[PDB]
């Protein structure tokens, strides 16, 4: 019981476009109660019951090619953007980058949430999404 979910991104390569998500709660990190479902074709989390949710996401990146890669990477939540986050990729001097953002959002009945990745980077290939660490999560605050 309860009204909450947490999805884990499938994507590893930095490619501009909508992210795909793991939604099976048999996977580590993934939560999905009733009233919340994942539409695989459009890559959207569908909210059945209307109300106010604390919605958050986080983005971890790791340097996969030594001595290369620079710029920034952004996430945007679309129901323009209801939630946004940019993480700077440092030039090579540490091989990780983290971001976190959270907010109270009013979501309508049937509201569909999609997440888009955008990359403003030189040598994209040098950085990837840390597997298991890019997450979209929410839980209901309204009774």
């Amino acid at each position: 019981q309860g009204m909450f979910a947490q999805l884990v991104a499938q994507n590893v390569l930095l490619i501009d476009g909508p992210l795909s998500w793991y939604s099976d709660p048999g996977l580590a990190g993934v939560s999905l109660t009733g009233g919340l479902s994942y539409k695989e074709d459009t890559k959207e989390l569908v909210v059945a019951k209307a109300g106010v949710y604390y919605v958050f996401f986080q983005l971890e990146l790791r340097r996969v090619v030594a001595g290369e890669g620079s710029g920034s990477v952004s996430l945007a939540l679309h129901l323009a953007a209801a939630l946004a986050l940019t993480v700077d990729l440092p030039p090579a001097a540490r091989n990780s980058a983290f971001g976190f953002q959270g907010r109270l959002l009013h979501l309508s009945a049937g509201q569909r949430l999609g997440v888009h990745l955008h990359t403003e980077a030189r040598a994209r290939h040098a950085w990837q999404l840390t597997q298991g660490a890019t997450v979209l999560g929410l839980f209901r605050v309204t009774p």
């Binding site: 090619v65 040598a123 994209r124 290939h125």
Partner: protein, 135 residues
């Protein structure tokens, strides 16, 4: 001039009443008529002797293995160009954006377009390596 009669390999000698004396050791005159012979070029250190000096011709230098000539008649030597560079007439220069060279003494060629072969870019190239394409 009387000196005009002095052939290559000799000089018209002002100290000996304009006779045609042979060029001293380590000198040459490639044409006739000279009042002195020219000192032979020495190819030492980084230079090695390609052609020896004779009485009628100067020595000529090239560079020791691992090096190559730059300018003039090989007035300078330069270490052979490495990965990421090509030999120009002004020396070893980096490959410009979009091109690469992965071999020593190689030429800068443009990066492979993976999309021509219906493939994706897995790793972008640099001046030292080509793009890595993937199916």
């Amino acid at each position: 001039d009387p000196c005009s009669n002095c052939p290559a390999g000799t000089f018209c000698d002002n100290n000996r009443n304009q006779i045609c004396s042979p060029c001293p050791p380590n000198s040459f005159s490639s044409a006739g008529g000279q009042r002195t012979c020219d000192i032979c070029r020495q190819c030492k250190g980084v230079f090695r002797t390609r052609k020896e000096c004779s009485s009628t011709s100067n020595a000529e230098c090239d560079c020791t293995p691992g090096f190559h000539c730059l300018g003039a008649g090989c007035s300078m030597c330069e270490q052979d160009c490495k990965q990421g560079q090509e030999l120009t007439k002004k020396g070893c220069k980096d490959c410009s954006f979009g091109t690469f060279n992965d071999q020593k003494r190689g030429i800068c060629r443009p990066w492979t377009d993976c999309s021509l072969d219906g493939k994706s870019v897995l790793v972008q190239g640099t001046k030292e390596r080509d793009v890595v394409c993937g199916p």
